[PDB]
Design a protein around this ligand. Structure first.
Ligand SMILES: *[C@@H]1O[C@H](CO)[C@@H](O)[C@H](O)[C@H]1NC(C)=O
Ligand SMILES: *[C@@H]1O[C@H](CO)[C@@H](O)[C@H](O)[C@H]1NC(C)=O
Ligand SMILES: *[C@@H]1O[C@H](CO)[C@@H](O)[C@H](O)[C@H]1NC(C)=O
Ligand SMILES: *[C@@H]1O[C@H](CO)[C@@H](O)[C@H](O)[C@H]1NC(C)=O
Lengths: 212, 33, 209, 215, 654, 98, 230
């Protein structure tokens, strides 16, 4: 059993989002003991609002709540630093003794300058055995983290092997990705050029490697 | 002479088959002395 | 919770005497009073439960009665094996307690004490302390009041009944620092005893020889 | 220090056993009660066993099988979560939560988390290939390993400054592959050396390669 | 701002669980309680000093005597074929007769056994500190003896019982000690820091006995009240309802026997008996209550409620107690209706079990003496039908004694009436009991007045008309050499006269038996249309006067009739007529021409010996054809009393 | 020591109508004391903190005697409540107070 | 015969922890209450604690001055009974006795109808913060003013010794008539100091030489102090 939270809610720099949460009458509408926890992607969550409009030590005056009937609505007030983490909900349920919400994702809409940084490496100089030399193309520091990567590599892309990570944001509040062109044979025994092309909202950002 | 037998008695009086159940006891309250 | 008050504190009786030991209860505890005897150096011995009933083996000399507030214990034809201390105990309510204890001892005629002082040896004055001991020897009864002429800081101890002559002995010890001894010069022993119509004193001062 | 980090366990066969030991330090262990909270890799956040103070009242969730045996003892400050059979391949990131105590029903402290993958595929040892520096950019690749976690420690002690580690890729073969990059001053690369000291705990295999510049 | 809802925050160490309880919702679902009455009853804001001062005040036992007692199967299984009768809906068509199985439902019966409702647990000094105020449907038994200076009030619900000893002594201190009995799972609610294990005295697998009083009240009570709580709790659990009631009924008669009900010495067994009277009423109502809407067998109800009726009727004479509740009108009318389905005069013809079962309903159906006097005809028929089938002069049987005792109450209750309409049947009953009081009868009873359980309870000598039962003559019929437990011999003889309190009054109404010689009567023998008064003197205003050869030492033996119970205007003038001797009688007879007569044999040294009422032919056959007549012993005469007022002496047979 | 049971000041009143959110405490928390604090519904900020400390052993026995007298309408939420109050009432130091 | 040999005593610093043990042989230890009674040196008895009966399921109860500190543990299959002592104060210095409790009128319940019939040999518990120290012997000089009708009664003063027991003699035990060895007295400094005296004629002052033998095993100290008049 979980509390029904909105899937994904978005807001801009201001007083844009006060995310909600609801549950059973014996879970939230029965006790003033709901709580909120913020979790950044791939890190330990920490208490963000304990009870209802009762904040812990070390929390700005923007995080608040709502004392509705059976719906607890976390209130991040009228100023927005870029905190694009997942917000969760929980309360002391008489039936389940602890019940957690679904989990949402607030996305801030500001500072649009991203300009991803690309770095492309030759196949590993140490490794020389057959069927073992793969390319590595790295992309970091972009936003909103919706990029399309491709490998032209000649007059026309052969696209034999293409495997790309989903953009996973981390420290500095900008996303990062990785795409490994996993194909040594069938092309790279002898050829002219090879390129890792990156497209972010429309851009010719590319890297070219085929040395020696 | 006839053997000794019990003297005849009167038939039983017809008791109330139809009372109130409130008058056979009285008030439902009571106080311990 | 209930307090026991025994009487008397001390008791003296020779062989064949008839003694009675009173045990006063705090509040009303009907017949829930037991008696025990304890000889000096041994464990207590069960004597009486329910304030009138005796444990199997206790001789017929022992007998006690009383109920409620007042309880007693009476001995007839006092035997030498009875010379010990007796206690009464209440078993009615929690927390349970015992009595102050009544000490029965052999009696005799009065005996005048032998009182004399012991100035502290110069072996102690070189250490930093001083000890003046007043001594009483072979006196009866145990009740005797010795008192250094303060006009506290003193201690004493008494010996048990000497089985040879039924007498006692007392040694009151006074300890004063060396700096004080030099010119205090009072140092007396006021010995008051019922066997002394005139209290004998042993006055002294810090004077050599 | 109020560090509350679990020792944890690696991957396990469906029909297997594991004893997650949540080691906690700093605070008073006997005053609070302990918890376990697990997170599915996608978005889930489910609740697990509830061991109380001095082991007086033990609670469990409904989704947890009820045959997940938790226990603890405050003499040696730790928290064992003994799982048995776990043949359900429903894994999660088992965090170690801390109950606020008093009258508050909230979590005041949390743990680092433990990744326990459950699949029918054996482990695969990683093969680290060194990348080339060829103004300032380095690299180090980890290829053909299964499963996570594989955290890249950079030069044991190269402080995290430019040390950036990209997430693993979902390879069609099932194995994972990650790569790490460090930005060292290109003014002088040969004055001092660098290595990527990465270890694979679920496979127990350490391999170290160095970075050597262009010719 | 009414009583709506409160939250209960529990600090389970580390967990901090929460609970909620709404007053508005459940105060109407299960009414009968008000939280604000209990809130301003528990001293929520009591300081720690006042709570401990109250804790040290109530006496607390130093332990709990644990004994595992098993309980019996009191209420039997429902006889397949019985008719379920509603206690509140009873009409003459529900039952067919005595030989029809039946059982009364337990739910309407409980509402009739506990119709009265009241505050059980008071707010007195010892009680207001331990329990909470409880008010349930109760049935209490209350009495007071020494001018209200000693009170007892045992109140009980359908699951637990509480008795309360209250004695006020001289200056005004009222020492109150109470005992509680019932299932440990149904004991009343405790208030404050009090726990039950520190207060219970005996605790079984499911039952417990609690003692609630102060240290000062317990100490003063411990002087004269040292009960045997071991056997008390054992009999209060292991015994059934009827067996435990008859057990208390026996010990109550023993108190009435020697002193007791006239001067109650505040003994240990005396107060022990008062509590067990309330337990006897409790186990009956408790066994019925422990049935889950089933039905209680009617034969078991008649067997248990007969004991409570006698128990209530014996305390109304002994202590003048008051019993409210435990009297279902449905049972009182179902048993009273069952009297028209049988014939009173022909009641003795039924089976022995049906005889005892019909007499239990005779007392339960008409508890109030006077509603139907014809019940004497049934009890007289049982005694008459038992005399013809009983070996002459032999002591009675446990079964027969129980059969006649179980119907003797309808005779005793009618004897307490000032005027009675069933005159002849009362004289017929007293005549048979007089003919039953043989020398062997008062020999087994005197032997049974030390060892036997049933013997001392009942004997037809108590209802007899013999008046020669002095302490000297009763000592001449001991059971053995009189050295076998010698102390019990003199105590039993002195007690037999103690059980001659039949018509010892508190109203002056024993004018129910025309002579001027009261304390010298030897026997009264009422036949048809003549009653003979045997006496030791001449002054009896009778229609004749006979004198038999008396002893050798001056104690004359007279007997004189009164024709048609109409005494003459003056005493006789001339010498009283001598009883004539007759020898012309056929020992082998063909008809009961002796029926209705009274055959009496008396000795010349120990006074009278026997009395034999000739009832039928089977009785006369066992008189003549037996060795009853012994003429070789010249000093053993046989005086025959006729219905014509004539008196003869049989001297020979052919 | 967590709180203190005080003598009733003459002008202080208590009515079961305005009281809500009662706090019971375990023994290990307060040196073995049974301390209960009586509060009201949170009416915001009107200067008022009506925290009313009371004798826990009397409060616990009151809620035990008010759930047993109404056991017919005792739901699962209250069945657990009655059992937890019983175990908490017996795990206290009734006699151990000096 | 019923024996209640007990042990476990010893010297404990204030605030420490000590465990005593009482063995039983001659009855069923489960079917009898077991109480403890201590007695301070020179003072009377004091009821300490109680372990209940088998019917009572072995629950404990202590007096108001020791309740929150002590703990009673019962070992039954093997007859043993311990009374663990925690946070010992200076007032617990007493002779703790092992006591067996039995009820007489048991059919009347457990109210007050009990007693104590068998007493253990008694164990010693001394609560002090001192340590082993050799006694400093000081001779009490037979002053010239000690005529006393012809008796001098010289003595020796054992001063400031903690190790509990000491024995003394005069002239290697030759002189025993008139010897009055007084009991020890715990001074304010926490160290005992007793005194021994033996009576001797006054005309023998100068002819006979009297020496006291302060033999002491605990601190393995033996002194032979010669006494001379002032
Ligand atoms: C409640 O407190 C008052 C305060 O003096 C006290 O007198 C009263 O006796 C207490 N209630 C009970 C039942 O003891
Ligand atoms: C008894 O009474 C009636 C007169 O009332 C009489 O006719 C009857 O025969 C009498 N019987 C005897 C035996 O006297
Ligand atoms: C309770 O609340 C009402 C207002 O709704 C107020 O009039 C009354 O005085 C209050 N009583 C207490 C004791 O707080
Ligand atoms: C405290 O509670 C524990 C159990 O939680 C219990 O064993 C103990 O008796 C209680 N009292 C004290 C003083 O620890």
């Amino acid at each position: 059993s979980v509390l029904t939270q909105p899937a994904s809610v978005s807001g801009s720099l201001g007083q844009s989002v006060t995310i909600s949460c609801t549950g059973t009458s014996s879970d939230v509408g029965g006790y003033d003991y709901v709580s909120w926890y913020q979790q950044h992607p791939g890190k330990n969550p920490k208490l963000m609002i304990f009870e209802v409009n009762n904040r812990p030590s070390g929390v700005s005056t923007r995080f608040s709540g709502s004392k509705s009937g059976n719906t607890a609505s976390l209130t991040i007030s009228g100023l927005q630093a870029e905190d694009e983490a997942d917000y969760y909900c929980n309360s002391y349920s008489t039936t389940t003794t602890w019940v957690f919400g679904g989990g949402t994702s607030l996305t801030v809409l500001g500072q649009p300058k991203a300009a991803p940084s690309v770095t492309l490496f030759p196949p590993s100089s140490e490794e020389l055995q057959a069927n073992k030399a793969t390319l590595v193309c790295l992309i970091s520091d972009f936003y909103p983290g919706a990029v399309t990567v491709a490998w032209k590599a000649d007059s026309s892309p052969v696209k034999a092997g293409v495997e790309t990570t989903t953009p996973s944001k981390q420290s500095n509040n900008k996303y990062a990705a990785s795409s490994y062109l996993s194909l040594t044979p069938e092309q790279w025994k002898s050829h002219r050029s090879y390129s890792c092309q990156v497209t972010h909202e429309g851009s010719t950002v590319e890297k070219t490697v085929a040395p020696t | 002479k006839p053997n000794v037998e019990v003297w005849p008695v009167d038939p039983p009086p017809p008791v109330n088959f139809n009372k109130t159940a409130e008058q056979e006891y009285g008030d439902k309250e009571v106080k311990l002395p | 919770d209930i307090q026991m008050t025994q009487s008397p504190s001390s008791l003296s009786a020779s062989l064949g005497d008839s003694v009675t030991i009173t045990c006063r209860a705090s509040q009303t505890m009907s017949n829930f009073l037991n008696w025990y005897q304890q000889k000096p150096g041994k464990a207590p011995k069960f004597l009486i439960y329910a304030a009138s009933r005796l444990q199997s083996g206790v001789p017929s000399r022992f007998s006690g009665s009383g109920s409620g507030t007042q309880f007693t214990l009476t001995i007839s034809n006092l035997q030498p094996e009875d010379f010990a201390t007796y206690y009464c105990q209440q078993s009615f309510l929690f927390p349970y307690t015992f009595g102050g204890g009544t000490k029965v001892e052999v009696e005799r005629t009065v005996a005048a004490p032998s009182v004399f002082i012991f100035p502290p040896s110069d072996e102690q004055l070189k250490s930093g302390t001083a000890s003046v001991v007043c001594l009483l020897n072979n006196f009866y009864p145990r009740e005797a009041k010795v008192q250094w002429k303060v006009d506290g800081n003193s201690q004493e101890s008494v010996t048990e009944q000497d089985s040879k002559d039924s007498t006692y002995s007392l040694s009151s010890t006074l300890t004063l620092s060396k700096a004080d001894y030099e010119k205090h010069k009072v140092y007396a022993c006021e010995v008051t005893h019922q066997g002394l119509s005139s209290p004998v004193t042993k006055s002294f001062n810090r004077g050599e020889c | 220090e109020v560090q509350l980090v679990e020792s944890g366990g690696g991957l396990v066969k469906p029909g297997g056993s594991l004893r997650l030991s949540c080691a906690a330090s700093g605070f008073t262990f006997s005053t609070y009660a302990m918890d376990w909270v697990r997170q599915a890799p996608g978005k889930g956040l489910e609740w697990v066993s509830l061991i109380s103070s001095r082991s007086s009242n033990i609670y469990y969730s409904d989704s947890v099988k009820g045959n997940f045996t938790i226990s603890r003892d405050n003499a040696k400050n730790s928290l064992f979560l003994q799982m048995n059979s776990l043949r359900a391949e429903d894994t999660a990131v088992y965090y170690c939560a801390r109950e606020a105590g008093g009258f508050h029903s909230h979590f005041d402290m949390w743990g680092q988390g433990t990744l326990v993958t459950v699949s029918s595929a054996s482990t695969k040892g990683p093969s680290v290939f060194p990348l080339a520096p060829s103004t300032a950019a380095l690299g180090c690749l980890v290829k053909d390993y299964f499963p996570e976690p594989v955290t890249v420690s950079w030069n044991s002690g190269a402080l995290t400054s430019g040390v950036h580690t990209f997430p693993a890729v979902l390879q069609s073969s099932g194995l994972y592959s990650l790569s790490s990059v460090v930005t060292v001053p290109s003014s002088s690369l040969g004055t001092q050396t660098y290595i990527c000291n990465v270890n694979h705990k679920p496979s127990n295999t350490k391999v170290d390669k160095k970075v050597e510049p262009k010719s | 701002a009414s009583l709506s809802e409160v939250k209960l925050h529990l600090d389970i160490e580390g967990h901090a669980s929460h609970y909620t309880i709404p007053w508005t919702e459940l105060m109407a679902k299960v009414p009968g309680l008000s939280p604000e009455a209990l809130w301003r009853e528990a001293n929520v804001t009591e300081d720690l000093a006042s709570m401990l001062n109250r804790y040290k005040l109530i006496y607390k036992t130093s332990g709990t005597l644990g004994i595992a007692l098993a309980e019996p199967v009191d209420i039997p299984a429902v006889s397949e074929g019985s008719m379920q009768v509603d206690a509140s809906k009873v009409h003459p068509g529900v039952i067919s007769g005595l030989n029809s199985p039946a059982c009364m439902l337990s739910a309407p019966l409980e509402k009739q056994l506990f119709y009265y409702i009241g505050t059980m647990l008071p707010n007195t000094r010892p009680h207001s500190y331990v329990f909470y105020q409880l008010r349930c449907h109760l049935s209490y038994v209350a009495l007071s003896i020494n001018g209200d200076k000693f009170q007892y009030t045992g109140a009980m619900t359908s699951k637990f019982l509480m008795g309360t000893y209250k004695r006020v002594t001289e200056k005004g201190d009222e020492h109150v000690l109470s005992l509680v009995f019932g299932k440990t799972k149904d004991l009343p609610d405790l208030r404050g820091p009090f726990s039950y294990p520190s207060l219970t005295s005996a605790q079984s697998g499911d039952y417990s006995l609690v003692i609630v009083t102060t240290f000062v009240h317990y100490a003063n009570f411990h002087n004269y009240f040292v009960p045997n709580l071991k056997d008390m709790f054992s009999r209060a659990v292991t015994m059934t309802a009827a067996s435990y009631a008859r057990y208390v009924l026996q010990k109550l008669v023993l108190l009435e026997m020697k002193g007791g009900c006239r001067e109650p010495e505040l003994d240990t067994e005396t107060l022990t008996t008062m509590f067990e009277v309330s337990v006897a009423f409790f186990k009956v109502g408790h066994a019925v209550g422990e049935t889950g809407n089933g039905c209680v067998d009617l034969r078991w109800l008649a067997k248990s409620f007969f004991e409570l009726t006698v128990l209530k009727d014996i305390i109304g004479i002994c202590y003048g107690a008051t019993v409210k509740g435990m009297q279902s009108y449905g049972l009182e009318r179902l048993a009273a209706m069952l009297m028209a389905t049988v014939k009173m005069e022909e009641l003795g013809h039924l089976t022995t079990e049906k005889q005892e079962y019909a007499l239990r309903l005779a007392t339960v159906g008409y508890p109030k003496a006077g509603v139907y006097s014809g019940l004497i005809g049934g009890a007289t028929s049982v005694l008459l039908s038992a005399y013809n089938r009983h070996p002459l002069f032999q002591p009675l049987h446990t079964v027969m004694r129980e059969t006649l005792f179980i119907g003797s109450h309808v005779v005793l209750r009618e004897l307490r009436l000032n005027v009675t309409t069933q005159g002849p049947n009362l004289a017929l009953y007293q005549l048979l009991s007089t003919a039953l009081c043989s020398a062997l009868e008062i020999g087994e009873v005197l032997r049974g007045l030390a060892l036997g359980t049933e013997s001392g309870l009942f004997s037809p000598c108590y209802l007899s008309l013999r008046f020669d039962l002095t302490r000297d003559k009763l000592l001449s019929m001991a059971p053995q050499e009189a050295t076998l437990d010698q102390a019990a011999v003199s105590n039993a003889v002195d007690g037999f006269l103690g059980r001659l309190s039949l018509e010892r009054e508190d109203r002056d109404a024993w004018h129910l038996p025309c002579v001027d010689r009261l304390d010298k009567v030897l026997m009264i023998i009422p036949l048809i249309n003549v009653t003979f008064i045997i006496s030791s003197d001449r002054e009896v205003r009778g229609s004749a006067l006979y004198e038999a050869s008396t002893t050798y030492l001056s104690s004359s033996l007279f007997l004189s009739p009164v024709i048609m119970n109409k005494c003459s205007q003056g005493a006789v003038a001339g010498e009283p007529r001598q009883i004539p001797k007759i020898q012309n009688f056929t020992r082998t007879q063909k008809s009961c021409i002796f029926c209705g007569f009274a055959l009496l044999s008396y000795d010349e040294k120990e006074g009278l010996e026997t009395t034999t009422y000739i009832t039928s032919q089977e009785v006369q056959n066992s008189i003549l054809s037996s060795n009853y007549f012994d003429f070789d012993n010249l000093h053993v005469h046989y005086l025959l009393l006729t219905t014509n007022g004539t008196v003869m002496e049989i001297a020979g047979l052919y | 020591p967590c709180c203190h049971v005080t003598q009733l000041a003459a002008q202080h009143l208590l009515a079961l109508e305005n009281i809500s959110d009662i706090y019971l405490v375990s023994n290990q928390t307060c040196d073995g004391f049974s301390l209960a604090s009586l509060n009201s519904p949170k009416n915001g900020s009107n200067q008022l903190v009506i925290s009313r400390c009371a004798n826990g052993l009397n409060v616990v026995s009151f809620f035990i005697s008010i759930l047993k007298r109404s056991s017919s309408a005792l739901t699962g939420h209250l069945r657990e409540l009655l059992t937890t109050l019983e175990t908490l009432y017996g795990s206290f130091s009734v006699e151990d107070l000096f």
